[PDB]
Amino acid sequence: QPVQGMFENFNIDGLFFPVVSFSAGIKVRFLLGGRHGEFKFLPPPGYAACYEAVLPKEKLKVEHSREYKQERTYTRDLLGPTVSLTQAVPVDTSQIVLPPHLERIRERLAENIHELWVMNKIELGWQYGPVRDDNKRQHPCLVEFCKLPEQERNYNLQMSLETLKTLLALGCHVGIAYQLTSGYKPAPMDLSFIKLTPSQEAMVDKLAENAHNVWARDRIRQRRNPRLVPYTLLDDRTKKSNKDSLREAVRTLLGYGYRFRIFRAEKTYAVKAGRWYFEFEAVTAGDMRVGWSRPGCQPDLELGSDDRAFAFDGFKAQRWHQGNEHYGRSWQAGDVVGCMVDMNEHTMMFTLNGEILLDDSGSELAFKDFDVGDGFIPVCSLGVAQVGRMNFGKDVSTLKYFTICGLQEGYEPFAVNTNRDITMWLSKRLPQFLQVPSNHEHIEVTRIDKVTQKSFGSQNNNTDIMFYRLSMPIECAXXXXXXXXXXXXXXXXXXXXXXXXXXXXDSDFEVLMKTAHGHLVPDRIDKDKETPKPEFNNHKDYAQEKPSRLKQXXXXXXXXXXXXX
Amino acid sequence: PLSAGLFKSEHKNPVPQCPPRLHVQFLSHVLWSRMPNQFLKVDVSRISERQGWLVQCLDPLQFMSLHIPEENRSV
């Protein structure tokens, strides 16, 4: 029996997926069709299932929701950002005026495609009959080219036209350079002797891809055949057949003569003396930096770009500080790097798979003569689709290159004398709200005080959009639920009057101009009034009240929504 | 009558003042998160039986969190 409610009129932007959330003490079973499960009831008409929603020729498993929420030891593959699956229309060819100098070739290759359309059917055993059938092994479109009408020759004609236009669009130039049947004699020449170059082979592949894209765009109007996927996502068994049909066109043409993520440890684990060594394994060879930072490092700035970190990047073999210097060599997929810091000598060293790194001046030392400050904490940074692994010690049985380097010079693991693991802080993604600090460039907020205002100011050369918000939110009781936005004239705005029990926080999203003196003023006419006084260039700044919302982007609409029934 | 006179203690004061708590907050990105030292340890059946996809969770796990009310956020 269905329920009497649903979340109508909600944002359809995104890739929806089924999810189940549980705390503890639960045994749940997803139910699909086929080998995955068995439905207990009958689905309503039209509604398919997930075992059919899976893409063809792809496996189906169950991750948790986002990340490595697995009860595992230090051997957790911590990952950085990712891409949008790189996939979440054919090539334009008809927009090219067909040159008549090779229209005779467009007809010759069309006749060749037609005679091969005869050839394959006759290889299977088809005669020339007056009935358009496929099981009666006959075809009425096998007669000589001239006798073919406009109702039978247009197919091959267009087949030749589209291939030539696809060639001109791709960029290469087109120019100047037996089984007895039932009446027809298809035999142009021996066109299957000269080896076809790999460029022309990839070209025939592209022609087949374009034809398949057109045919699939035609097919989407029908149900759900597994071939409705693009040619790149097509099974490789039938891939060669489509390429073979398009190879003959180029064969005739030739023959006829024509957002990184930062990870670190707890700030309290900082060190000020001794020799500390830790391992960083990387199964990939992408953008990955590793080093030692101070307990003031930024979770958004480049690791090492400031005076708060000293790192090393193998993707370019460069030590990272305020600037970059070529140091050491690059790594590959499935490597390790041991980082050592001596605070008694202020000496940083890195060993790639036990091999100590060398600089340009022939010194194994990486960094020297740095202030101890408040301490140095290990840190790593991963780029897009980069996974790694950190080892702060405590498992000498698992540490590989400790005996090779570190065991003899008085160097110790970072967490050798520990009874519990490290907290392993990271850089969070959701950008929550923070108070404007006084030592913040390009954004200054002042305070004045008649009426009380909170003026703004800025000095910068690059512009963006901000999301300024008040601290204390106004709460609404059970009865109260309405909000009216009155401009310089009267109240003309969207009907935002729905809040049984909520807390709205006043906010304004202002674009940063060269001069931005827009501010908020708590005023009074008859009730609670906040005036976000704007100035020149006021066409994209917004001002409203918002609950807890964590999204950083540049959009006036496309905001999340849902109306429950 | 006022904005400040709605989310504070007093309400019969129609003079629009601003206490020091009212300060502009911008959507910032300088924030660290703490990776917990213990997870739920959810075990999938991994058999994919023909009568459903099983997910199981038995061991309980709790944690305490402060609630900042004027920010309406749990930490």
**Which residues lie below 8 Å from residue B61, measured CB to CB, with a gap of 6+?**
A24, B38, B39, B40
**How far is CA A92 from each of CA A97, A334, A387, rounded to the nearest angstrom?**
12, 43, 39
**Which residues lie below 8 Å from residue A530, measured CB to CB, with a gap of 6+?**
A506, A520, A521, A522, A523, B3
Residue A132 φ/ψ, nearest 5 degrees: -80, 90
- Asked whether the beta carbons of residue B58 and residue A25 sit closer than 8 angstroms, the reply is yes
The residue in chain A having the minimum alpha-carbon distance to the alpha carbon of residue B42 is A70
State the smallest CA–CA distance between residue A72 and chain B in angstroms: 9
What's the rounded Cα separation, in Å, for the pair A122 and A125? 4
Closest CA relative to residue A341, chosen from A267, A406, A244, A253: A406
What's the rounded Cα separation, in Å, for the pair B32 and A434? 12
Give A520's contacts in chain B (Cβ within 8 Å).
24
State the smallest CA–CA distance between residue A480 and chain B in angstroms: 13
C-beta separation of A142 from A118 below 8 A:
yes
C-beta separation of A128 from A138 below 8 A:
yes
What's the rounded Cα separation, in Å, for the pair A430 and A450? 40
Sign of the alpha-carbon dihedral angle for A98, A101, A107, A110: negative
Per the entry, the structure determination technique was cryo-EM
| Radius of gyration in angstroms for the set of CA atoms belonging to chain B, rounded to a whole number | 24
- Asked whether the beta carbons of residue A433 and residue B34 sit closer than 8 angstroms, the reply is no
State the smallest CA–CA distance between residue A452 and chain B in angstroms: 6
**How far is CA A320 from each of CA A305, A347, A355, A367, rounded to the nearest angstrom?**
7, 15, 19, 10
Closest CB from A37, A424, A434 relative to B35: A424
**How far is CA A254 from each of CA A161, A170, A250, A251, rounded to the nearest angstrom?**
16, 17, 6, 5
C-beta separation of A270 from A375 below 8 A:
yes
- Alpha-helix runs per DSSP H in A178-236: 198-219
- Asked whether the beta carbons of residue A71 and residue B41 sit closer than 8 angstroms, the reply is yes
A172, two tokens: 């290469």
- Asked whether the beta carbons of residue A469 and residue B24 sit closer than 8 angstroms, the reply is yes
Residue A209 φ/ψ, nearest 5 degrees: -65, -45
CA dihedral A181, A186, A189, A194 (to 10 degrees): -90
State the smallest CA–CA distance between residue B66 and chain A in angstroms: 16
Query: What is the count of residue pairs from A and B with beta carbons less than 8 Å apart?
Result: 187
